[PDB]
């Protein structure tokens, strides 16, 4: 049928990573873009069409309540088990994320209107600051 | 304030590559996830929170009418100015994508409720398949 109309989803797709080393697309950005999924939203009315086709990188989605612990699988990080508890230290969103890694958590606290995000794992610390939209 | 309702997009992600690597996480994702902004919905009711954190790998927009010809830039994928001719050939939207490639061009059909796009450069051919939501 011609009727494109409607939002599509990638149940498969073969042979990306031929097609798209045949357009000289860089090493990193090929392995990658063959692992994620693409959303096609199509608005055709007539002989004129609109095709928004979008890839989504990351989206990770974890619901708790403070005080709680519960099962948290970082599936688009690391995908690991950890068991992760969420209390408040002042107005500090604070997290541990017991797991094999060492010292793994997280801080969240806004002042102002940014959102303060303090991501540890070992030795490392990652600090994301965030505007309300 | 422990109100941290709202949508918020990433400012500054600092040192997020030393963080993906105490996760273990392999070297073209750090290169990718570190160039990509991120933005955080938190739904909160008390303490009942809802974090649901996205980052977009690739998003495309194009507006074309079937049997006017146009110009294309691949904003994603390939980065290259093609001028574009999108035709019927029965139920198949037939595109041909003048360019530097030989042979670039793509067939979009509909079957049933999938959505078959057939992408084509030099010798390498990718089949993506959708389904419709």
């Known amino acids: 049928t011609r009727d494109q ?18 357009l000289d697309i860089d090493f990193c950005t090929r392995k990658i873009a063959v692992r994620l999924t693409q959303t096609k939203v199509i608005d055709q009315d007539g002989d004129n069409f609109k095709d928004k086709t979008t890839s989504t990188f990351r989206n990770y989605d974890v619901d708790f309540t403070v005080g709680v612990e519960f099962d948290e699988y970082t599936k688009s990080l690391d995908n690991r088990h950890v068991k992760a508890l969420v209390t408040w230290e002042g107005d500090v969103l604070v997290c541990v994320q017991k797991g094999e890694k ?22 490392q610390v990652c600090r994301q600051v965030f505007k309300k939209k």
Chains 1, 2 share one sequence.
């Open 5 to 22: 109309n409607g939002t599509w989803e990638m149940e498969s797709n073969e042979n990306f990573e031929g097609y798209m080393k045949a």
């Open 102 to 123: 060492e010292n793994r958590g997280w801080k969240k606290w806004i002042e102002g209107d940014k959102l303060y995000l303090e991501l540890t794992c070992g030795d």
